[PDB]
Amino acid sequence: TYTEDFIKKQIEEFNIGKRHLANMMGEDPETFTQEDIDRAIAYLFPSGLFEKRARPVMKHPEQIFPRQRAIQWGEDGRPFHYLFYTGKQSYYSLMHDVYGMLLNLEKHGSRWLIKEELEEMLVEKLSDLDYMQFIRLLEKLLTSQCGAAEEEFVQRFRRSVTLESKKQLIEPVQYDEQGMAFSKSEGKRKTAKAEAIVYKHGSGRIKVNGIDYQLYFPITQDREQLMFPFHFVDRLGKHDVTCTVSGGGRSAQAGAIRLAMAKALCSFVTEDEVEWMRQAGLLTTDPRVRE
Amino acid sequence: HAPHYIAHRKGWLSLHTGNLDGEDHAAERTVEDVFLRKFMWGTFPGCLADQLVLKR
Amino acid sequence: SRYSPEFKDPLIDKEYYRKPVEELTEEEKYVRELKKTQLIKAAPAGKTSSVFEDPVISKFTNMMMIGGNKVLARSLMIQTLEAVKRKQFEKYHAASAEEQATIERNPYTIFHQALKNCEPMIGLVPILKGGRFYQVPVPLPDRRRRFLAMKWMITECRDKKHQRTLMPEKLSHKLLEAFHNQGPVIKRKHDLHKMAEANRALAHYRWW
RNA sequence: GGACCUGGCGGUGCUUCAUAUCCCUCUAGAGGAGCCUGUUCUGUAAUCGAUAAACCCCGAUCAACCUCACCACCUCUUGCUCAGCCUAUAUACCGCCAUCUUAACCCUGAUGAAGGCUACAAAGUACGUUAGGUCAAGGUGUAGCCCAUGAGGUGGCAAGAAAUGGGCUACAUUUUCUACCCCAGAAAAUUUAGC
Ligand SMILES: [Mg+2]
Ligand SMILES: [Mg+2]
Ligand SMILES: [Mg+2]
Ligand SMILES: [Mg+2]
């Protein structure tokens, strides 16, 4: 256990050590901050331990010792809160407030708070049924014509985590010295890595490492893989490709080029066609690799 | 702490360049460490609170 | 598996995406809107949006590979198709006028009909009790009989009685025999259908 | 003798489903030939027993006239050096591996045995162990024989038959050789995984 005098003494010890560290590092003690403390301790006591907690640390005493011991009554013994004897003064105070707002209104991509976070904010353990009751009251408040104050009050309990949209970031359009528009993109399959440049206008010429694709890829399967992206969006014979692939083997190189070409081509199609390519598997990096 | 924490929570009691890639004489440094530890544990009997740290 | 459970298999069908939004029913529209939130696996090497793609021939080729040699298996498949085509052209040229109407020259049609003529409808599934693995007739699923036709054709062509006759030549001959409901694979289907008729004692066990 | 309470059946079946491990079903390869090992039977006076200890050096190998081990005969010995011997013991310890074992408070029932839940809420809240293995990448002791458990010599010993358990080689036409690295020319039953 940690007494209050004990933590008091740790507070003066931390402040004096902070002033000393400011002296050691040459920084001005007045403006010497906690990020500066962390940086200086990292320099002076280098530690490559993977656990960040195991590394040397110089925190404020309040950050080290939990001391979640709140005083709820004074010297005369009178509790501060009028709901003290319920044992859940914060939770029931909040329910009382919500009910008051509901009465007042009756006279007139985001998520509900989880139970343990609600506990953290209320600093009191609460059951599942009472959590459900509170959430039901909040829903009832939302259903009514909540004003700005009530909307903000509910937003205090609303978290923004829900929903995430997979939109396939498009590459920008670059322009070469001749004035032609092109887009560059990268792809990887097994140990093969490819970078493709797809021009907006062309006659369907694909050059792999400066070599024609049918000469670079004798096997028909690789040529079909290279055909797949352009055929899927019905623009065969409308673009020129200049790619560079290294590593891997025949099939890995063909797949990496397919991926790079699809990602580069996404610049010159409509967003609907981009999403269709994504749903066809043409824009996902294949993570399957050897053990 | 168990041996699988040697670079996660614990450190190395001995610190020398022998085991780095390209360096030599790791065996000689190891034998030196062995003798130092036995000698020191025999010369300070019941005094040592913990393990030695051997820096080089 | 390197893919997380949330990843979904891709849909390579190309005409699927070209349906007008007007035709889309509410359920299909909901499915399409749902597909936007999911992660989709990378399309595997193999199937493509090509108009010449044939999943049955792809599966037959995969069932012919040995030790991951896909180039050789595909070479054998194309050689077999070309051999069937040339044989049919030879038979068509030498035929009189009224027999040229009933000679098929599309090798894909012949391949599909040959495999269809070899599919078994019913088979036997062993069931364990008493130390006696009880052989009950069972109606084979569609996938099962499709697999069995291909497996019987391949095993028939891999027989060692056929000495130094190359695989495309054996396979085209067997395919053209099965096209006309002849050969050893059709007899293998028949000798399963009769040998399951010979064991209709346990013909109503419906919980295999 | 009367009343009541906890039991005990690690019990027995039957009903429905969650029913994941485990099952099957299903998919792909694995029996022949020639050598080498495991067990049995038969047979010898005896071991087809081993090479920090032979030979072969293309690989590997059998018995080699190496040498040790065994059987039948013999010889030494105060000798090598107060000699000599992997002879035993971890069933001596230590090292290393492995086996197993390792609450309080508050209420209710008349302050009986005893009991305590309802959410639009009604008392509930807080190390040892082992006739264990290892004397090959390691040690500290203890005992044995010391006319023989030491050192030599002369002959032999070199097995036979199966049924099954296991291992190694070559085993092809979807093959082989050359050129290329893929459009060429010539030759000819259980079991193992599944994901
Ligand atoms: Mg001896
Ligand atoms: Mg010995
Ligand atoms: Mg022992
Ligand atoms: Mg012998």
mmCIF file of N, CA, C and O in Angstrom, chain A residues 118-155:
data_model
loop_
_atom_site.group_PDB
_atom_site.id
_atom_site.type_symbol
_atom_site.label_atom_id
_atom_site.label_comp_id
_atom_site.label_asym_id
_atom_site.label_seq_id
_atom_site.Cartn_x
_atom_site.Cartn_y
_atom_site.Cartn_z
ATOM 1 N N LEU A 118 -17.619 2.690 -20.185
ATOM 2 C CA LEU A 118 -18.569 3.416 -19.354
ATOM 3 C C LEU A 118 -18.174 3.318 -17.887
ATOM 4 O O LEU A 118 -18.309 4.288 -17.137
ATOM 5 N N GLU A 119 -17.681 2.150 -17.468
ATOM 6 C CA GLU A 119 -17.167 1.993 -16.111
ATOM 7 C C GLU A 119 -15.970 2.901 -15.867
ATOM 8 O O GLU A 119 -15.874 3.547 -14.818
ATOM 9 N N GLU A 120 -15.047 2.960 -16.827
ATOM 10 C CA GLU A 120 -13.870 3.810 -16.682
ATOM 11 C C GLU A 120 -14.272 5.262 -16.490
ATOM 12 O O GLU A 120 -13.714 5.961 -15.637
ATOM 13 N N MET A 121 -15.234 5.737 -17.278
ATOM 14 C CA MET A 121 -15.653 7.128 -17.145
ATOM 15 C C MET A 121 -16.440 7.354 -15.855
ATOM 16 O O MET A 121 -16.268 8.385 -15.195
ATOM 17 N N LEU A 122 -17.301 6.409 -15.474
ATOM 18 C CA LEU A 122 -18.048 6.524 -14.225
ATOM 19 C C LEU A 122 -17.239 6.118 -13.000
ATOM 20 O O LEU A 122 -17.735 6.281 -11.881
ATOM 21 N N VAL A 123 -16.031 5.582 -13.188
ATOM 22 C CA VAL A 123 -15.146 5.122 -12.117
ATOM 23 C C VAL A 123 -15.913 4.286 -11.097
ATOM 24 O O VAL A 123 -15.650 4.365 -9.893
ATOM 25 N N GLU A 124 -16.853 3.471 -11.571
ATOM 26 C CA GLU A 124 -17.614 2.587 -10.699
ATOM 27 C C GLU A 124 -18.011 1.347 -11.482
ATOM 28 O O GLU A 124 -18.454 1.452 -12.629
ATOM 29 N N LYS A 125 -17.847 0.181 -10.864
ATOM 30 C CA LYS A 125 -18.256 -1.059 -11.505
ATOM 31 C C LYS A 125 -19.774 -1.125 -11.607
ATOM 32 O O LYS A 125 -20.492 -0.805 -10.657
ATOM 33 N N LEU A 126 -20.257 -1.545 -12.772
ATOM 34 C CA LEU A 126 -21.683 -1.629 -13.045
ATOM 35 C C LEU A 126 -21.976 -2.928 -13.780
ATOM 36 O O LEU A 126 -21.111 -3.481 -14.461
ATOM 37 N N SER A 127 -23.201 -3.418 -13.614
ATOM 38 C CA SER A 127 -23.606 -4.700 -14.167
ATOM 39 C C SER A 127 -24.017 -4.558 -15.631
ATOM 40 O O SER A 127 -23.975 -3.474 -16.219
ATOM 41 N N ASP A 128 -24.401 -5.686 -16.231
ATOM 42 C CA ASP A 128 -24.834 -5.666 -17.624
ATOM 43 C C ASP A 128 -26.248 -5.118 -17.758
ATOM 44 O O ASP A 128 -26.544 -4.369 -18.697
ATOM 45 N N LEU A 129 -27.139 -5.484 -16.835
ATOM 46 C CA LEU A 129 -28.523 -5.033 -16.931
ATOM 47 C C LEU A 129 -28.636 -3.525 -16.766
ATOM 48 O O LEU A 129 -29.395 -2.880 -17.496
ATOM 49 N N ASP A 130 -27.892 -2.938 -15.833
ATOM 50 C CA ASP A 130 -27.954 -1.491 -15.670
ATOM 51 C C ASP A 130 -27.323 -0.769 -16.860
ATOM 52 O O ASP A 130 -27.785 0.307 -17.257
ATOM 53 N N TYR A 131 -26.279 -1.357 -17.450
ATOM 54 C CA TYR A 131 -25.729 -0.814 -18.688
ATOM 55 C C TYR A 131 -26.772 -0.819 -19.798
ATOM 56 O O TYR A 131 -26.912 0.164 -20.537
ATOM 57 N N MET A 132 -27.519 -1.918 -19.926
ATOM 58 C CA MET A 132 -28.579 -1.974 -20.927
ATOM 59 C C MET A 132 -29.653 -0.931 -20.644
ATOM 60 O O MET A 132 -30.178 -0.308 -21.570
ATOM 61 N N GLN A 133 -30.006 -0.745 -19.372
ATOM 62 C CA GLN A 133 -31.003 0.261 -19.012
ATOM 63 C C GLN A 133 -30.544 1.659 -19.414
ATOM 64 O O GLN A 133 -31.320 2.453 -19.967
ATOM 65 N N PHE A 134 -29.278 1.976 -19.144
ATOM 66 C CA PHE A 134 -28.745 3.280 -19.520
ATOM 67 C C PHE A 134 -28.756 3.460 -21.034
ATOM 68 O O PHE A 134 -29.116 4.531 -21.543
ATOM 69 N N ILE A 135 -28.364 2.420 -21.772
ATOM 70 C CA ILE A 135 -28.347 2.517 -23.227
ATOM 71 C C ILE A 135 -29.761 2.676 -23.769
ATOM 72 O O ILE A 135 -29.991 3.399 -24.746
ATOM 73 N N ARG A 136 -30.731 2.002 -23.152
ATOM 74 C CA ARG A 136 -32.115 2.135 -23.586
ATOM 75 C C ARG A 136 -32.621 3.553 -23.355
ATOM 76 O O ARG A 136 -33.325 4.117 -24.200
ATOM 77 N N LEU A 137 -32.266 4.148 -22.215
ATOM 78 C CA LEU A 137 -32.634 5.543 -21.978
ATOM 79 C C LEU A 137 -31.998 6.465 -23.010
ATOM 80 O O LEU A 137 -32.636 7.413 -23.482
ATOM 81 N N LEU A 138 -30.735 6.220 -23.355
ATOM 82 C CA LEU A 138 -30.077 7.057 -24.356
ATOM 83 C C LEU A 138 -30.755 6.922 -25.717
ATOM 84 O O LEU A 138 -30.923 7.911 -26.443
ATOM 85 N N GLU A 139 -31.146 5.702 -26.084
ATOM 86 C CA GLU A 139 -31.883 5.504 -27.328
ATOM 87 C C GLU A 139 -33.217 6.241 -27.300
ATOM 88 O O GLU A 139 -33.614 6.860 -28.296
ATOM 89 N N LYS A 140 -33.924 6.179 -26.171
ATOM 90 C CA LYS A 140 -35.182 6.907 -26.045
ATOM 91 C C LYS A 140 -34.959 8.403 -26.208
ATOM 92 O O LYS A 140 -35.772 9.099 -26.827
ATOM 93 N N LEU A 141 -33.868 8.917 -25.644
ATOM 94 C CA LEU A 141 -33.551 10.331 -25.812
ATOM 95 C C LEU A 141 -33.297 10.662 -27.277
ATOM 96 O O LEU A 141 -33.766 11.691 -27.777
ATOM 97 N N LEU A 142 -32.562 9.799 -27.982
ATOM 98 C CA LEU A 142 -32.310 10.045 -29.402
ATOM 99 C C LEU A 142 -33.605 10.054 -30.202
ATOM 100 O O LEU A 142 -33.767 10.868 -31.118
ATOM 101 N N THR A 143 -34.528 9.145 -29.885
ATOM 102 C CA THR A 143 -35.778 9.069 -30.635
ATOM 103 C C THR A 143 -36.559 10.377 -30.549
ATOM 104 O O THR A 143 -37.149 10.817 -31.541
ATOM 105 N N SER A 144 -36.583 11.007 -29.379
ATOM 106 C CA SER A 144 -37.244 12.295 -29.241
ATOM 107 C C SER A 144 -36.438 13.384 -29.949
ATOM 108 O O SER A 144 -35.282 13.196 -30.338
ATOM 109 N N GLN A 145 -37.070 14.549 -30.111
ATOM 110 C CA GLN A 145 -36.466 15.683 -30.813
ATOM 111 C C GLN A 145 -35.401 16.326 -29.924
ATOM 112 O O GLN A 145 -35.583 17.394 -29.336
ATOM 113 N N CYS A 146 -34.263 15.644 -29.836
ATOM 114 C CA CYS A 146 -33.159 16.132 -29.021
ATOM 115 C C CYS A 146 -32.570 17.406 -29.615
ATOM 116 O O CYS A 146 -32.295 17.479 -30.816
ATOM 117 N N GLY A 147 -32.367 18.409 -28.761
ATOM 118 C CA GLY A 147 -31.743 19.647 -29.172
ATOM 119 C C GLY A 147 -30.229 19.546 -29.204
ATOM 120 O O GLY A 147 -29.636 18.480 -29.046
ATOM 121 N N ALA A 148 -29.594 20.702 -29.415
ATOM 122 C CA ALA A 148 -28.139 20.733 -29.526
ATOM 123 C C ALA A 148 -27.473 20.234 -28.250
ATOM 124 O O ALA A 148 -26.531 19.434 -28.302
ATOM 125 N N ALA A 149 -27.953 20.691 -27.091
ATOM 126 C CA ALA A 149 -27.370 20.260 -25.825
ATOM 127 C C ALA A 149 -27.524 18.757 -25.639
ATOM 128 O O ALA A 149 -26.577 18.064 -25.247
ATOM 129 N N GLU A 150 -28.713 18.232 -25.933
ATOM 130 C CA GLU A 150 -28.948 16.802 -25.787
ATOM 131 C C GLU A 150 -28.150 16.002 -26.805
ATOM 132 O O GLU A 150 -27.651 14.917 -26.485
ATOM 133 N N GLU A 151 -28.013 16.519 -28.029
ATOM 134 C CA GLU A 151 -27.185 15.847 -29.022
ATOM 135 C C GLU A 151 -25.738 15.761 -28.559
ATOM 136 O O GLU A 151 -25.098 14.715 -28.699
ATOM 137 N N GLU A 152 -25.210 16.847 -27.993
ATOM 138 C CA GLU A 152 -23.852 16.817 -27.461
ATOM 139 C C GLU A 152 -23.740 15.841 -26.296
ATOM 140 O O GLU A 152 -22.740 15.124 -26.163
ATOM 141 N N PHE A 153 -24.759 15.803 -25.437
ATOM 142 C CA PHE A 153 -24.741 14.886 -24.303
ATOM 143 C C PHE A 153 -24.692 13.438 -24.769
ATOM 144 O O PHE A 153 -23.939 12.625 -24.224
ATOM 145 N N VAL A 154 -25.495 13.089 -25.772
ATOM 146 C CA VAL A 154 -25.427 11.730 -26.303
ATOM 147 C C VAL A 154 -24.094 11.489 -26.999
ATOM 148 O O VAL A 154 -23.540 10.386 -26.936
ATOM 149 N N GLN A 155 -23.565 12.502 -27.690
ATOM 150 C CA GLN A 155 -22.269 12.343 -28.342
ATOM 151 C C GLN A 155 -21.165 12.077 -27.332
ATOM 152 O O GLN A 155 -20.160 11.439 -27.666
#
